[PDB]
């Protein structure tokens, strides 16, 4: 422990999440990502089952990291005097969904369906584990290009899932729902569904629909690319202005546009290889 267990490589990226380095676990040459967070920048703290006081991000990652899933899993973590270091899986080769959509433009609906289905399964898995991500967006989704699997990252804005109202939010505003913009109040699942509507529009049109507060609360969805009427209907449903008018996850996955999804390996061979 701990500079002896891992070989550190190039900086992958930095920002509101911290600084993330490529790495290799010396034990077995498993590729990892090594994420450093400074203690002074951490706003939300939690307690591990053992009672150890850790960043909420560690709490949430531990709750979602058991078993296989579409979430980048936490393998280990360490406390330093001024920071926490998180050891995470690193699929290879990868590209995040933001860069993927930038380079390829609007995605074919078959490909958007496969990606969107996998994001729904991943978000369902988080909610089943008691975890609300609160920052679903293309920047927080990695694509394993060989396996055709999508992986959720960056739980640094998340929370334990509850059925009462949330009055705090630190995710991405252009993915946040109109009830947050207008009233600084939202419920977890219906807010998640809103961000998934933003994400689906992003995939099939090549960029997000709203950039300004007035557009978010105006709730008019102009389609800038050719999109089937069934996909348009699902998007507009997810972006219903009234939270209670939005679909549940079950209603999304039962939607006609969502049927006959490709398998992950079919998605890779057809669209990614």
């Amino acid at each position: 422990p701990l500079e002896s267990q891992y070989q550190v490589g190039p900086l992958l990226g930095s920002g509101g999440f911290g600084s993330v380095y490529s790495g290799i676990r010396v034990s077995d040459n498993l590729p990892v990502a090594i994420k450093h967070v400074e203690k002074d920048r951490i706003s939300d703290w939690g307690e591990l089952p053992n009672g150890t006081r850790v960043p909420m991000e560690v709490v949430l990652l531990k709750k979602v990291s058991s078993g296989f899933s579409g979430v980048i899993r936490l393998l280990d973590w360490f406390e330093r005097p001024d920071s926490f270091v998180l050891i995470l899986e690193r699929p290879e080769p990868v590209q995040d969904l933001f860069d993927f959509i930038t380079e390829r433009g609007a995605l074919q609906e078959e490909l958007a369906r496969s990606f969107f289905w996998q994001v729904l399964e991943a978000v369902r898995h988080c909610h089943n584990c008691g975890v609300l991500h609160r920052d679903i967006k293309d920047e927080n989704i990695l694509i394993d290009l060989n396996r055709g699997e999508l992986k959720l990252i960056d739980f640094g804005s998340g929370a334990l899932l509850k059925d009462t109202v949330y009055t705090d939010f630190d995710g991405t505003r252009v993915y946040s729902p109109p009830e947050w913009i207008r009233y600084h109040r939202y419920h977890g699942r219906s807010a998640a569904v809103w961000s998934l509507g933003i994400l689906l529009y992003d995939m099939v049109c090549g960029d997000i629909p709203f950039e300004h507060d007035e557009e978010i609360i105006g709730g008019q969805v102009f389609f800038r690319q050719r999109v089937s009427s069934e996909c348009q209907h699902l998007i507009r449903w997810c972006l219903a202005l009234r939270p209670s008018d939005r679909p549940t996850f079950e209603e999304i996955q039962n939607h006609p546009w969502m049927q006959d999804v490709l398998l992950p390996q079919e998605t890779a061979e057809i669209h990614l290889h």
């Binding site: 509101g16 999440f17 920052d135 804005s157 991405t172 252009v174 960029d207």
Partner: peptide, 9 residues
């Protein structure tokens, strides 16, 4: 048309 990332927070 400009496409951009959006920081969290």
């Amino acid at each position: 048309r400009k496409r951009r990332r959006h920081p969290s927070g």
